[model samples]
Target: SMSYTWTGALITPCMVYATTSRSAGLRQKKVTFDRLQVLDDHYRDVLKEMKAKASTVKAKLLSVEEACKLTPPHSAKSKFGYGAKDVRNLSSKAVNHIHSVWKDLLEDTVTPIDTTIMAKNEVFCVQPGRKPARLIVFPDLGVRVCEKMALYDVVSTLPQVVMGSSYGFQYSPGQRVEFLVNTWKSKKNPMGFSYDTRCFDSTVTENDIRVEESIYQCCDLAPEARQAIKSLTERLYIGGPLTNSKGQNCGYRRCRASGVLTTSCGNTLTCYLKASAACRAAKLQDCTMLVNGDDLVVICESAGTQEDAASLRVFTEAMTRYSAPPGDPPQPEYDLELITSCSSNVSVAHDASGKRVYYLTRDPTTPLARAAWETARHTPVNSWLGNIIMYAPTLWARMILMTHFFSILLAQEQLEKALDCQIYGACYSIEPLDLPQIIERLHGLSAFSLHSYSPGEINRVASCLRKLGVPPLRVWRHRARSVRARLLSQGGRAATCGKYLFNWAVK
Candidate 1:
């Protein structure tokens, strides 16, 4: 018999499991051809769009790379408001190349740079993504060079000399930011370059070469930063005892009451707030507060708006006292450096919790940090959110979750192949049962049956297992969890009772 397989068709599967109480088995309603076909067509379309976009980005990269090769490093610096009189600051073509490379390597897509930083004889970095995109801090101090280090030069906490794209998220106030102020402000152009630190909703009002500070103003703090900060804070302090309504520990009694007030805690000034907030007044913040592009890096997260307040606070508290002992690399806990020069407005947390996590502020005088910061902000990272905000309103969180689920399924298949356990067999603990014997045992059942033994479900199951190369047990568990999650997400209750029966005559 000769037959052709339809490559476009979607094969569905039947999953089975027994209940502990033996009430009955449950079956997922088989999806209709119409529903399944929609996804099949949709995936094909998505693949097409992805390939087209990929080619376009590749073309752009080649052009950018050529520009990078031709342009002088100083000329590139001027694009970031670093050099030349009367010429408006334009982003270096090299900066975009770095970002494009990261998008290719990490996300498998063409995301624009949130910022870019490359110091002569120092550092070459890329910050990819826009919101929640990170500004990666690294050393780019000019000094004696190791042989052929220019192309491969990278070292610091992050091995990749790439800063994170803020993904358009504003850097929180009180966060340290750094950049090369000199690149923009020079002897010839006495009017220090003015740029907005978008995170703080402020302007970079001053570029004082003598003090090496670039002042900035912030409009409003971002909510996402506050939410993340709040989440971390709650996790930090959530260990105490639960209390009763009577104002005492519940002691496992009848009057069990959850006593924590969620609203009141976040409003107070505290250390995380103090160390980072500098002086934003503990006001609610969001993701759009801008900061002086040049001065916000080494100080805060990629889009920090309030590094100024944070720097001054550390100065006033004399917390910036002793220089860190240099020998080994700085650990997260021990790294306590603060921005020393910025506006004052850092607020203290009502209760001091822990030592500040150290992040080196970008010195507005450093070429690498400044250029990187400028380039990144100009090209926002292409993300699903941006697509949602700019292009499509139908895109939702479920679609993201669905995308992840498919990836996970594919990963599971790979893991199974690596383990070389593709075939179904009897458990080692079971009496020596071969595939036939297992099938026979499964065949006698009514409600509970093996998917691999069913003619309709068998092909799809095998394809999923073989193609994905995932173990049956893991796949089963994953499917079970997913189904449960879907049910819960849609607000359905677990079944109470049901009876199921099946009969099969073995030939």
Candidate 2:
């Protein structure tokens, strides 16, 4: 991020709901009843402290604001700029005009192919692999717009789940397979495993179903899923069909580019499609499919991306290290006492940051210490995780949309940002609109405006005024959002993103 044209930061204030719900009685005796005092005598002191903190933060943000001021905003025609469209000058009429044109094209262009028919819950079948190519006529010409899902997204976010085959298995027809997408619960609790929240049933087929190799695992699954499966399976395979990035066919251009694949399985897999502004422009039809794939026996397989798996592993390890040994003391210090246990299947269920803060200083056994610890340790991981989780969703989405976007770009950015600035796990005590609020505000803006506004403008205006005097991170946009390190990169790195690959031709 430091190698870029400009820099920025972000801040999010979040609501911390501290209720005397379960602990109200316990706190009654201990809390010194400072509520009235805090409002009256100490109010001015609190205001003074707030101003002091605000001053320190403002200085840092101004630095970023000044830096962004010096750097030119990358316009549509600017070299290496990969941002979305700029609609700053477009009036409502112009917008309507463009919409009209797009609508007409969409209507005229939509054509029902075999796949579309199948998507409508109609049944159809194609030959298995390499003959009489079956296709789903895309009405929206989605392939042209980058609709098809890519490999990186799943690899980085849900590495354990393979593309061709889903994470958990279900019954299928013939030797061919279908994607049995488990709900969000499946993402959390693996097959043969269950969580406290929910559990699902598995549908593993007794016999492998017959389907085209290409259409089998590749269909309905992401390209990354197909390629990853193929690499792992290490056998000659066929693909369902070669559609453009939009998941719409361009006369098999993608297939030809891919090379060495046969298509089969009655043409269309179970795919989902939808129409929306974002989906339309992105060429993503909001479609999905559950197609067939023949399982290649005798394969060594592992699931999930290294990072996701690594994160889970780290969390599990951390929990293990903090576990209590046998009986000893029913109570102990905060750090010394156990939080979660594999033996009892019980979790103390305290907040991550709050727990960390509590453990950082006092033991958890006594009443006084617990109250003191909560006040001290109530560092809001909830606030922190909001930003982290928000970025993660987008990062995963990008990885799904493009190649090299995750490994080469996102991972590095995440790591560097983690070091360059504190992006995760900061100290915030019951404040509305934590770091995530900035992101939510940015998300709330019109996409075109987001593309058009200068970063400084984006900062100085909009919810940013409140962040002028936040703490933990400095006042700058980068420090506020924990993304200053990345803002340094100034948008993107490429001769042209996807445009180059879109035009790539193969024999």
Candidate 3:
């Protein structure tokens, strides 16, 4: 009820049908309680600790020009004639409009903001029905700049400081793997489970936004920053009018604005708040939470499967009472590999020396699907490259991503040129020939040396390949050797990539 309030002007669907055997059907498929009443001392303790740390932060309000500089070059263009480049180049028109927008943020907090809603074309495999198109809603670029001015520092700086080690975004992929592995190893028998808050964006209440602000207010902020935060909370965050890309009135929204500087940080704080309270209330023992926005995973001491299962039920209930409910009830996981958070899970492989190595990977269904479409539509931020970078240690990423993209770059002879892809929320310019050093830095030497992958991981990769009619692993290995040779001929870092990234092909 809080997510969208529709106006009856009829919005049109832009999603096209693709021929597929997979039944994307059954539009698949939460708890309740008095929220404030159930929250206990531990709940308040995290808040107390958060606010105490938050008070130590001295975040300055960003000037219009300064925030404009932070704008991602590839960010969505405004419906107004100007785009990100216009903002970054300090186009007088865009800068003036942003200043005007900033003044109004302080003056008329009640005036509803306008957001353009559009469907995201992303790839995912089957269900019972064609899945609903993912909708992105963002205020006009002028106001978006103002938002950046107000919240950029708060979002980037506050959460990690307040939440400390529990803040998930602070970790790299390798660090994330290490945290998961070490946290498990630290426990006598670790019980971990990832909690999926159903429709996380929709669950955020106005009170939650206000609660988030009180934390921001704890900061040693400039007066303008404080006013801007309050105004943005009321005008932008709490709710707004939704317009479609064609400038037609579509609806109104009363929940979390999923596209804003505050989106990720707000979600992270709210989630950490709720999950921390839930864990304590459920009497979960020594629970360690890793929260990346709404993606939450908890590692706690095991009290046997029966006890863990029962506590998770209580954990679910506790979360429900806190106004964040689960989509699918969380199951306690005894083995680290069984837990999936951030859409990636721990997997096992053997190093060149036959020592066990743990790495992170996910099922490649979506990766393969997107890779297929990436053939013609070149994007500035390639999701496939990001996946490859983040999941470099995976056998699937090595065999397919390296072989596939390297061949394309070889065909065009752009192997030495750097391409941009986002890791976490930041853009990274990655080079095809630099994969060896990049992976070694981000993952480790074992990334190049990992072999003898876990069968479950191997099976998942093989099935994904067959589903997409991709040649199986051996065929990919031969192709990789060819790609490898091409890289080696170019020599330098290209040779370095061939030496390490495709070293397995020789073995």
Candidate 4:
């Protein structure tokens, strides 16, 4: 079976939008691997351990009603013509279609289900130069509900049970920092590296998808669930036909499907399995992996610089054999601050007591660029808000993101209204005024008092600001003081934001 078998028709841009030549070109660039992935004793042990833990878990089939409740009210509606509101309200038409889809899934295992392929609207500054559109492939809304009914329970339970603390989705940003810090500390002269995969979803093979299904099967499931899983694995999971918004058959895909229940779980399980085996094959000692989707960071005992470098080359080789080649090759780092995963690296800051506090920070180019874009035009997601929340302890986030967004919210007099920002894998609706408590709860009180950021982080922050043409820190500080004064004048949650979020501006 081909990874993609195309029909003569092109994907006409419509409701969402198109670049036909661009789409094919993007796929050509994207699909740009396999043979060394023989399952050795180490791989078998990892798989058995995952299975053993997974066997202890039990997940049942969800009722149609139950699955409907689980659907986000704002989820994309079906091209079949019913909206998310109809599904959430349990419209008989929607429910009936869902039942029909599920029943068909069980009855036909080999037929490929239809999926919508669209170009995601990425935010960018002017003159991004006709950027190649990022593609998103997903099934219809009814199929989504059916997916939730069949495998949502498995996704929720299996990763945590199998991977334990290494499962990154279960952690808050602060908790993730804590885990990374502890993992680093536990190692004697830690040598760590972050693995970058090339088109992780595209790299998934049919066999990898089947292995994920088998892991799901380890759970105690209902007969209906077992049948649904088996059928979905064959029809929807393994591959599906691609249609654009205009309902034209564009192509067929035999890779992992995005926006499905199993996307995250499948990626996590496969990543952990491949990485764990690679670690063993490379002879890494005391390996500790923190994985979220395809992002992997391993902190292990150093085998000296020469040996560690050679070991990482072997690690990359094994992962490549497993069909997960790196976009950038892995290299061992002795310094903990050098290893970045999930787009963040651990850095040091000072708490109120003058003690060192470890927190996560990333290069602010994307965040600041998106913030600048959001400032010019409204975007769907307020990434500034998420950056402020996740990277709250960093100097760049506090002085820049806090000042810019809060001042705007205050000017609009809509500070009370919450806006949505993505965190980990979920969206959180948070109020501008609640920044103080939100930071305290997630990153701890130390986050509010954090200062004296690591020199490397500061240098990167200054460089990003200059490149983006954003104002320097001192200018932001002056503006934040005014924002803080105005906030304090409000004398409530607004005042809390002023006192905590703008504390650095206080003379």
Candidate 5:
């Protein structure tokens, strides 16, 4: 919804499509949750806790005007035609449209939402790499607004309440890895299992969506809102249409669709329920589960390798019988560091001070594209900046995204204002000046240090830079020298800022 001042020449539209040959065969499926999932007492306990939190939620119904006010000024513009600025400024026509959407939510039966699918980072696709375009499916603005008013509160709170520290987004990368390691070592005979469901969102059946609605029904909803929730669930949550970029209807969804209200919260709850029950059925001892959507990892006491292997088979059987099958199949591991979750892997590295740092990291491609997009045009959210804030200590993020974006934002004198960038889908804001504090809190003092990255990780970083038309580390080093000089000249916290954020340059 927010617009940035763009001064650079626009990149050619030709940048969107890849010229390189497509990689052979589609990426193999890792796992599938196809069968109907079964629930048990543990599932019940999770639900009961979530419902209790939902009931105690005193989120008052906002009038359309009030709800509109809650919409961030920098939110993505509605594809329905009203730019985020118009909505943010409260244009009478825009206000009326938002009001109409609210009215529809209250009056109309829940209707399936038609989502438009497009490739993310179109420019990145045009590079030499033959990466498949990531499909971004999202509903129109009105439905999105309706979603915010309806379930945003629940989505923000319910998962954390139910899953506790196990909720993926609740922890920093360092904290997440630390938790995983601690949990793994906590057991006398620790064994770990992680599950990857093939196309998890696609596998969300209509029954699963309905079950999510049933859970929501346990909340203390207002009379009108309660009816509206049911209507939304049956009509939209159950499934919708998938429209391609050419405006052709590819197909209709019968399962839980993405780009709707409660997508995150619903998926988390349903996935946790199924996985927890599967653990119980497999008789996993003291199973501590971490679930982010369908990506699940269970840490528990291990029997012998044979017994652990057998237990995994039983786990697979339980999940398959419950309707959630494995895409790559489940494998039990004795090492926690080998387990991957939420597309991040636990890794060890030495920070600047030569202290060992355990952290979570993934490829830098998505964050790079997001930073590029923010640089060229208006974005409702600055995902690149958000990622930089959260992963500020990571080698890739600090060396690449931070160096690239902070320079751009600095050039535009928008560095201060860019603090409005959204994290966790507008649930949290990034404070630009608070970078030092945030980094120290999340990554400890290591945020000020150099990281000795593995050869493979270093290569990945180098490759991404080449693919993205980014300068080499030496070039970034040169740029940081200038940035640091300027920061030190500015006085106050800005003078010391270079010490915290750009210490890699000195190192």
Candidate 6:
């Protein structure tokens, strides 16, 4: 019941929905939710908060000219012949062409836009053991510009307002684990369920996109901005065309298009709306959710096992009715840590100080990619640095990302520059000097002392280092020792930080 834009160049090994696989071509599980669960005030609270935020958000609508200017000088160049720097410098041709594209977007009716697709590296197939290449869906430069003008604010802020604490990106690893544990303990009969939609993006039909527009329209807006939203929804948001590198028209998409203005916002709103409605129809109690894109986790008061099973069936039925079908059959879990969100799992390890640490972790493909980019080119953002900040307490990220990038930045004499990166699409600036403070804030003072990674983790980290051409952990050990000695000799908080983060230096 799904379509694809495949080409002969799709040479990457096959991948499955799950992160790690024990075998090849494993069939995805399917279960029937043929009934509906009834709903309550928890559902009402979510909608009310979303609407309130939407109404209060006085989003400034940028003109096409203005939005175009926001494009970074280092952004990927246009396939249509304009280099990013040329566009940034306002080459007359680039500017004029951008103007034409913007005009057509505002003036045209519902015409499909074109997308470029490719295999995403580093970040894909990180699930452990074996995995397939993850697909990167991208829009043209012009469409990307239009998307920023029309929907960037909505995508950035709307989900946080709507989901509140359920927003996955808002919490640190410790905070998330604390929340999960507290929620589980608080409930008299706690039961949790996570749902995965089948080809979630591809499943977003034209009607689903219109539903998102309807949600947007409910918010008060300037007449011109409102009309632009409606027009953009019809022309660009609803659907587009997918093309391969060979310039082949692989297919037409009538669903929510990836690589557009509403990529994050539309998916979140649609999934929340559908899932919340289904939860109500299934009669689940206290249905608190954590949704990032299509990845969803739900925790609610338990019915008996039999009742939960029956309720899940109803939930599935409601979801399918709304056109978002479950990729696998829904299963209930008594243990909260068993749930996966945004392809990350919460696991326990020890920091160097020998105290237990709970942190969020995923396959290291993304950080690897960021490190590779850092080595070869100048990038607008550093993914490795961002990950190190967020997962400062994690054994792998702290050891690998922190050591590798800092070494590179130090050697390049760029350590003091205020580098920009993002976590969950929000911008942040980080300086090399801020690492100690950031690590302490997010991971606590214990991060520098945390050690004792499992054999598996150590091996994975070592393998990744070799693969990425970064130095081994022992080299990091030597560098940290040297760095530690210098910083300690300097006699300040930096010295103390050096002592803790590289506590292994003493060894």
For TM-score, the strongest prediction is 4
lDDT of 6 by residue, 1-507 (tens): 233433333322222132322221121111111222233464455456567666665565666666677766555577788876676677776777777776776677567667765443333323435443344456778667766666665666666766677776567777887666666767789998889887677667666677577667666555655666887787667755666556666555555566666877778877887788788889898878777778888889998989998999999887787777787878898866567677566666685556766666665655666566565765556676777877776677766666666566546767568888866555677677777877887777776666675555567668876775667888777776776676667566556656666666686
Order the candidate numbers by TM-score, best to worst: 4, 3, 5, 6, 2, 1
TM of each candidate vs. truth: 0.15, 0.17, 0.91, 0.94, 0.76, 0.73
lDDT of 4 by residue, 326-413 (tens): 9899978989999888888889989999999988888787788778767777655778788888889889998999888889888989
Q: What local lDDT score does residue 247 receive in model 3, on the 0 to 100 scale?
A: 81
Q: Measured by TM-score, how close is model 2 to the native structure?
A: 0.17
TM-score of predicted model 1? 0.15
Give me the runs in candidate 1 sitting further than 4 Å from their true place: 1-259, 262-400, 404-507
The lDDT per prediction is: 0.21, 0.22, 0.81, 0.83, 0.68, 0.66
Q: Can you write out model 2's per-residue Cα lDDT over 393-485, one digit (the tens) per residue?
A: 122111211222222333444322221112221232322113224333433211111122223323332322233222211223222122222
Q: What is the alpha-carbon lDDT of model 4 when measured against the actual structure?
A: 0.83
lDDT of 3 by residue, 1-507 (tens): 345666754443331233321221111111111223245676678788789999999998889999999888778888678989999999998898888889898887687888876555555556434554445668988888898898888888999999888898889887888888888888888899998887787778777888899999999998988998998888889888877667889778777887877888999999999899888877888889899988999999998879888989998888887678888889888888989888889889998899998888998877766666666678666878888888898898899987788788889978778788877777888777667777888988988889888888899888878777889998998888898888789878778878888888974
* Candidate No. with top lDDT: 4
Candidate 6 at residue 157, lDDT?
Answer: 67
TM-score of 3: 0.91
Off by over 4 Å in 3: 12-42, 127-129, 416-420
Which residue pairs clash within candidate 4? Answer: none
**lDDT of model 1 at residue 21?**
13
Question: Considering lDDT, which of the candidate structures 2 and 4 is the better prediction for this target?
Answer: 4
TM-score of 5: 0.76
Q: What is the lDDT of candidate 3?
A: 0.81
Error of 2 at 364 (Å): 26
lDDT of 1 by residue, 242-361 (tens): 221222332111110111121111111111111123223222122111222222212222113344334333322321111111122111111112213232111111112332211212
